[PDB]
Amino acid sequence: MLYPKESETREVKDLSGVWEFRTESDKNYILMPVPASFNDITQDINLRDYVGRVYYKKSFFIPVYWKERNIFLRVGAAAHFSEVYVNGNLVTKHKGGFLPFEAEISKFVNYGQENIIEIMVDNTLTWDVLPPGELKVIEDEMHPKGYKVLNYYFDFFNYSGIHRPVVIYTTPKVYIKDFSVITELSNNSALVKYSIESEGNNFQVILRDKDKNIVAENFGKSGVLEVKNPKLWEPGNPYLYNLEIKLLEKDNFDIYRMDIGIRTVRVEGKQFLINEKPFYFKGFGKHEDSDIRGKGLDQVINIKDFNLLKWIGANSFRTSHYPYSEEILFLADQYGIAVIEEAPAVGLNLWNRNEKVFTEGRVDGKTLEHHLEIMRELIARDKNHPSVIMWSVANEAATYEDGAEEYFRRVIEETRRLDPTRPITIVENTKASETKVSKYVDVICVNRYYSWYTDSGDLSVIEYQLERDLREWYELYRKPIILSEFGADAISGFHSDPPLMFTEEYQQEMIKRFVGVLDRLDFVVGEHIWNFADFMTKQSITRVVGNKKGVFTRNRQPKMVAHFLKERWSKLPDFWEK
Amino acid sequence: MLYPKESETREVKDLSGVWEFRTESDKNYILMPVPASFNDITQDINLRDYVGRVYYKKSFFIPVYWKERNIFLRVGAAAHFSEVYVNGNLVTKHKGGFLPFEAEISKFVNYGQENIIEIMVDNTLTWDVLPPGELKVIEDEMHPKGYKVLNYYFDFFNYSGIHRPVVIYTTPKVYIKDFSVITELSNNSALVKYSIESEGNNFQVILRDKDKNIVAENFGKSGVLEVKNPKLWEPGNPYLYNLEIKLLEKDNFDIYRMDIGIRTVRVEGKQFLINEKPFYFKGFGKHEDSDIRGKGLDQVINIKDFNLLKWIGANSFRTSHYPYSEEILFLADQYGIAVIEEAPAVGLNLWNRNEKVFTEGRVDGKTLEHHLEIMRELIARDKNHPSVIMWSVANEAATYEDGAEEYFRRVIEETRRLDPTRPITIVENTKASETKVSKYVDVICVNRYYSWYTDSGDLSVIEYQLERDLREWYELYRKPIILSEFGADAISGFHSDPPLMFTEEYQQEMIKRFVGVLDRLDFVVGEHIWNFADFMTKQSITRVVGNKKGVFTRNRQPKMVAHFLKERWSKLPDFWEK
Ligand SMILES: [Cl-]
Ligand SMILES: [Cl-]
């Protein structure tokens, strides 16, 4: 499914705005913005911590002239289970809170009249949705009848609601359903190879440069476009060409356009190559999180975040720990930021080797089935973005378990089959010698928190422990390694010398000592600090109103270590043969 | 008067601790620690803001064996007017809140019995005490009968109380009253020249090195001690010799010891020479200020402050804006920190050229008389500390006024007469071409706040304005220049990019741009940032609970710019021929 875009042949109507909202088995509505998480909008603590079904409702008018058009209703994201009703008719259901879903609804609309859309969203986690969790009953001596808790083991808050825009769009009855683009370098040219999915068959395809000059054209539902003297897309030079696809049939006419970038990505030895040059990742793990709206899409915050990425000198980030909005990937295309996009397989770990995760009752064949469908949906959505340069299949799963090996072999095999054009990783906090899964990926991503979660407060252990660990990863697997997470919680304004945990000084010193180690290791091709910004988590005595490891505050202002990273990364080239 | 020190011939009894305390015309006492300001000790807002007389009271016992000894009662400091009573007898009065005073009290004590000391302290400012102020009656339409305000124009809070220790000490009836030491370099030796003040006349004087080896000796009330192969005192090498003075008479025997340092100080051209090498000041304006105790002496805070000075790489500070406790100068001697010690002539300015300061009714002959007595008391107290390397006669007086010229000519002339061994400065915020006073000093000290108090928020003006200004100071006066103050208020934890006033970023960027200018000017011999730490001021819409220009918080932890200064100053030598 293609991102909804207006053209000569397609209308788009955005239903974002103020909706009516209620919780299960309640008749009274309140007002609720869309897109947004509902948790922080009100002062009702029982809604903040609500677990169950909520219902959104809105009126909309369909123009009579949309008859004899396809009418699609698209929901960008709703966490985690959703059902969509048009005038009381169920038009689609969806499982998974971080990818879009849509249905054709012309059969159910009142033309030239009022219509009602209702969207049910259920935030109840189970062990066969990603990320997983479990609702548990607690009726003991200290809890009243009916006390229940939603348990989950990922470290970000279970925000719920409609997190990305709801839109209605039209197409002709015979229309461009999808297309695939692959770019190759050939002699002094680039090739853009394409295939179009449609019931139609007569297509003209045109490629235009930045100045609207036509640089290539082809008649054909599949084909190759040759670009002589191409300008390649890469961090530091985000050149985009505009691909125009025109269906020209007897009764149907359809146009779809997308900006694409010409680049190659390849792993060879201990090098991560973009356009055949050795890349060095400088960046962050991020989160879709901001004040008040929770996980809701906000283009103000998105553009602010990319300007901060360019300001600090980052060239990349990982979409920890789930696919982000398409909007963020289009921006990464424009700004020239390399993206590792990650499936929502986070929380597959009970920090305890006595509780097994990959076992009947928890992560099983049903979870695997969902994970495989997720990879198919994710690659289908994002396969044409130049900014996505790697897929991450999971974050900190219990990869030391025997059952994790067969599980992830299947996930990894399916991902590569779906997209052979990008490398694959998995983000590990398991010990190097214990993971049964990292031997199957292209690039190793390791999260390490020496002197924070272990030997807390003792910065002196970092060089000893980190160098020994990373050398063992390389000795066992002989793959490029990204230090995919490291950092320390810092309360803005907490200062100390000597540095103490939770101060800005400790965060900067820890990060500084980690990267001094990486500079001595020629097989380390990247550093991603956790996290870009402070974000909300569930409440616990270990979380000082959320996770405070941001390099920026939640309102997008820098802590001390942001300036250290700006100075370091201004000296580090994007392409660096270590 | 010499600092009270125990020896074979002298006892010291410290009366610090818990005293009884009351305000004027009130019979009920509360408890009050000494030394401390009384303002922040209680939760009584009317005592915090009290103006008038307060009374301290304490019992003490004199041993019968102190008969036929001199018994001295010393008050380290009490702001600003004080009277001392022993068993109801007035033994001394004192004017000025930052220098010690004492009296011989054997005539008034009950030997082997209880005694009562009472100390009255008055914090009411006038135009003939330093620093000056004025109590004003405000009985208009919006103020009730009896509303009064203490107006003053210096930017630190008018803390009051007994700020330094009260002690009683004994001496023999014929005793060492004072001594003067001057050090010179001669061939490969150093000379320590001395004169002793006493009714006695037979003296043996011995000088010992760090390991208690005797390196020089002399019999004589005046004389010269030769030190072959001297180890000189300087920042980065604080070598101290111990001077022992022994009075040996028929009926009287007295010993006094003091650590001294061998160093010379001299201004020549645009150079400030210590031990004939070109010094570069790296440091701060400080304040005697800390949480809860106000201006009270606290040796924990003092030692913490010197360890921070060494940690950040500072080699100097100015005692803005008054003499500090003797304790701090003994520590500066031990740590090797160069001190510019300043008289309390601050607040001689009504930021307004229509209100004249040096005029009948304000700063006049009575103020001058007090200022001259202050310089005599200050040099008499501190003349033998190696750490004091310069006297500052005032801070930000209205030196553009005609009347300021005659006033300060007399102050400067008297200071040089009292101590020809150290250079003299005055700290200016007047425009270079307008001051009528800086032409009379040895070193120029200028306070500049471009982009803070003027063109607020615009960091881009700094290089243009500061370089032009400092070149004009040098062109007019041809003297070495210290940038004696510059900085910005920063709330700990306030961050922004781009930098905004009151953020840690703005403070660091402003300071960074100022010192980049100084590095290009070979006549600038010093940089002192305002301030070492956040300190309290009177309340106003311009003061966010005090002055927030500290590089350290009030609890002595670093802000962002502290780390910038540590890195800069670790690269700058103490002795630097620019
Ligand atoms: Cl974390
Ligand atoms: Cl100031």
Contacts of A266 (CB under 8 A, 6+ apart): A273, A276, A423
Exposure string (b/e) for A51-71, b if CB count within 10 Å is 16 or more? eebbbbebeeebeeebeebbb
Neighbours of B572 (CB within 10 A): 14
- Measured CA to CA, the distance from residue B509 to residue B9 in angstroms comes to 56
Residue A517 has φ and ψ, to the nearest 5°, of -65, -45
Query: In this complex, do B495 and A557 lie within 8 Å of one another by their Cβ atoms?
Result: yes
Tokens 């929901």 identify what position? A75
Angle at which helices B326-335 and B299-312 cross, to 10°: 30
The tokens of B97 are what? 């809140």
Kindly tell me the sign of the dihedral angle through the C-alpha atoms of A70, A75, A80, A85: negative
Q: What are the angstrom distances between the C-alpha of A48 and each of A349, B298, B556?
A: 26, 49, 40
| Residue contact B492–A496, C-beta within 8 A | no
Q: Give helix then strand counts, H and E, for chain B.
A: 8, 33
Let me know: does A371 contact A96? Beta carbons within 8 Å.
no
Looking only at the bridges linking them, the beta strands covering A233-234 and B241-248 are unpaired
The owner of tokens 């006390």 is A147
CA B156 – ligand 2 centroid, Å = 10
Does the distance separating the beta carbons of B553 and A497 come in below 8 Å? no
Instruction: Round to whole Å and give the CA distance between B314 and B281.
Output: 8
> B505 and A563 in contact by Cβ < 8 A?
yes
Contact B135, B526 (CB under 8 A): no
For testing the chain B interface, which of A310, A560, A568 should be mutated: the one with the most B CBs within 10 Å?
A560
Q: How far is A311 from chain B (nearest CA, A)?
A: 10
Quick one: which ligand is closest to B489's CA?
2
The total of other beta-carbon atoms located within 10 Å of residue B565's CB is 23
Distance CA B484, CA B529 (A): 7
Are the beta carbons of B560 and A560 separated by less than 8 Å?
A: yes
| Contacts of residue A469, Cβ cutoff 8 Å, sequence gap at least 6 | A432, A446, A448
| Structure solved via | X-ray
CA A79 to chain centre: 14
Cβ-Cβ contacts under 8 Å for A225 (sequence gap 6 or more)? A191, A192, A193, A194, A205, A207, A216, A217, A218
Residue A560's closest chain B neighbor by CA?
A: B560
The C-alpha atoms of residue B56 and residue B41 are separated, in whole angstroms, by 14
The continuous run of DSSP H or E covering A307 comes out as: helix A299-312
A237: its two tokens = 């030079």
SS3 of B345-399: the string is CECCCCCCCCCCCCCCCCCCHHHHHHHHHHHHHHHHHHCCCCCEEEEEEEECCCC
Nearest CB neighbour to B492, from listed A493, A497, A559: A493
Picking from A311, A494, A560, the nearest residue to B497 by CB comes out as A311
CA–CA gap between residue A460 and residue B74 (Å, rounded): 49
Residue of B nearest to A307 (CA): B497
Query: B281-285 and B524-530: which strand pairing?
Result: parallel
Return the residue in A307, A491, A495, A496 with the most chain B beta carbons within 10 A, the one to mutate for interface testing. Answer: A495
Interrupted backbone of chain B, residues before each interruption (C–N > 2.5 Å): none
Contact B98, B158 (CB under 8 A): no
Q: What residues of A are in contact with residue B498 (Cβ under 8 Å)?
A: none
Q: Are the beta carbons of B495 and A311 separated by less than 8 Å?
A: no
- Taking residue B316's Cβ as centre, other Cβ atoms within 10 Å add up to 26
Residues of B whose CB is below 8 A from A563: 505, 560
Quote the CA–CA distance of A459 and A449 in Å, as a whole number. Answer: 11
Least CA distance to B559: which residue of chain A?
A495
> Which of A496, A553, A560 is closest, CB to CB, to B557?
A496
Which residue from B495, B553, B560 is facing A553, i.e. has the nearest CB?
B495
Largest Cα–Cα distance of chain B, in whole Å? 77
Q: Could you give the angle at the alpha carbon of B314 between the alpha carbons of B313 and B320, nearest 5°?
A: 160
User: How many whole angstroms separate alpha carbon B453 and alpha carbon B534?
Assistant: 18
Residue carrying the six token digits 């109840």:
A124
Cα B341 to the center of its chain, rounded Å: 5
| Burial environment of residue B462 by CB neighbours within 10 A (0 to 12, 13 to 18, 19 or more) | buried
Judge whether B21 and B37 are in contact, CB under 8 Å: no
Kind plus residue range of the DSSP H or E element containing A306 = helix A299-312
Q: Which are the contacts of B107, defined by CB distance < 8 A and separation ≥ 6? A: none
Provide the total of helices (H) and of strands (E) in chain A, helices listed first. 8, 33
d(CA B121, CA B84): 9
In three state form, how does the secondary structure of B395-423 look? ECCCCCCHHHHHHHHHHHHHHHHHCCCCC
Identify the bridge partners of residue B167 per DSSP, sorted by sequence position. B14, B74
B127, B354, B356, B390, B454 from B348: Cα distances, Å:
9, 14, 10, 21, 21
A563 Cβ contact list (under 8 Å, min separation 6): B505, B560
For residue B43, count CB atoms less than 10 angstroms from its CB and return exposed for 0-12, middle for 13-18, buried for 19 or more: exposed
Q: Strand runs (DSSP E) across A11-154, as ranges?
A: 12-14, 17-23, 30-34, 36-37, 53-61, 70-79, 81-86, 89-95, 101-104, 114-122, 133-137, 148-152
**Domain around B373:** 266-571
Interchain contact, A560 vs B504, CB within 8 Å: yes
Q: How far apart are the first and last CA of chain B?
A: 40
Which amino acid, B374? I
Q: At A513, give phi and psi (nearest 5°).
A: -75, -35
Q: Which of B311, B493, B504 sits opposite A497 (nearest CB)?
A: B311
Name the residues of A annotated as catalytic. Answer: 396, 485
Q: Residue A512 corresponds to which amino acid?
A: K
Q: Which residue of A has its CA nearest to B553?
A: A495
Q: Where are the beta strands (DSSP E) in B198-289?
A: 203-208, 214-219, 222-228, 233-234, 237-238, 241-248, 253-260, 265-268, 271-274, 277-278, 281-285
Catalytic residue IDs of B: 396, 485
Q: B94 near B101, Cβ under 8 Å?
A: yes
The number of CA neighbours under 13 Å toward the Cβ of A83 is 10
Contacts of B20 (CB under 8 A, 6+ apart): B29, B30, B31, B32, B56, B57, B58
Q: How far away, in angstroms, is A550 Cα from ligand 1 center?
A: 10
Side chain identity, residue B365? G
The sheet carrying A214-219 orders its strands as A214-219, A203-208, A241-248, A253-260
Q: A476: buried, middle or exposed (CB in 10 Å: 19+, 13-18, 0-12)?
A: middle
Of A492, A494, A505, nearest to B495 by CB-CB distance is A492
Concatenated DSSP letters of B127-170:
TTSSS-EEEEE--STTS-TT-EEEEE-SSS----EEEEEEEEEE
Interface residues of B toward A, Cβ cutoff 8 Å, are 308, 311, 491-497, 504-505, 553, 557-560, 562-563
Which 3 state secondary structure label does DSSP give A92?
Answer: strand
Query: Measuring CA to CA, how many Å separate A204 from each of A211, A213, A293?
Result: 20, 16, 43
Residue pair B308/B555 in contact by the 8 Å Cβ criterion: no
Asked if residues B244 and B206 have their Cβ atoms less than 8 Å apart, the reply is yes
Q: Establish, for the pair of chains A and B, how many residue pairs have beta carbons separated by less than 8 Å.
A: 40
Resolution, given in Å to one decimal, reads 1.9
List % helix, strand, coil for chain A (3-state, nearest 5). 20, 35, 45
Mutate to test the interface with A, among B309, B311, B495 (most CBs of A within 10 A): B495
Question: Which helix H or strand E contains A218, and what residues bound it?
Answer: strand A214-219
Query: Is A558 within 8 Å of B497 when comparing Cβ atoms?
Result: yes
Stated as kind and residue range, the H or E segment containing B104 is strand B101-104
Q: Does A495 sit within 8 Å of B558, measured CB to CB?
A: yes
Most B CBs within 10 A among A311, A312, A497, A551, hence the mutation to make, goes to A497
CA of A530 to the centre of ligand 1 (A): 7
Instruction: For residue A416, give the 3-state DSSP assignment.
Output: helix
Torsion of CA A21, A22, A28, A34, to 10 degrees: -10
- What is the β-pairing status of strands B89-95 and B133-137? unpaired
Residue of B nearest to A555 (CA): B496
CA distance B140 to B142: 6
Cβ-based burial of B364 (10 A; exposed 0-12, middle 13-18, buried ≥19): middle
Residues of B within 8 A of A495 (CB-CB) are 492, 553, 557-559
Q: Ligand 2 mean position to B106 CA, how many Å? A: 47
The residue of chain B nearest to residue A563, with distances taken between CA atoms, is B505
Q: How many CA atoms lie within 13 A of B122 on its CB side?
A: 15
Residue B436, domain CATH:
3.20.20.80
Q: Which of B493, B497, B505 sits opposite A493 (nearest CB)?
A: B493
Q: Which helix (H) or strand (E) holds B530?
A: strand B524-530
Residue B463 near residue B405 (C-beta atoms within 8 A)? no
**CA gap A350, B345 in Å, rounded:** 68
CA of B547 to the centre of ligand 2 (A): 7
Chain A residues within 8 A of B497 when measuring between CB atoms: 308, 311, 557-558, 562
Q: Which ligand is nearest to the CA of B531?
A: 2
B126, B107 in Cβ contact below 8 A?
no
What b-and-e string marks burial along A10-43, b requiring 16 or more CB atoms within 10 Å of the CB? bbbbebbeebebbbeeeeeeeebbbbbbbbbbee
Q: Are A482 and A528 in contact (CB under 8 A)?
A: yes
- Report the SS3 class of residue A232: coil
- Does A495 contact B311 at a Cβ distance shorter than 8 Å? no
Q: What residues have CB less than 8 Å from B544, skipping those under 6 apart?
A: B489, B491, B502
- Taking the C-alpha atoms of residue A320 and residue B238, their distance in angstroms, rounded to an integer, is 55
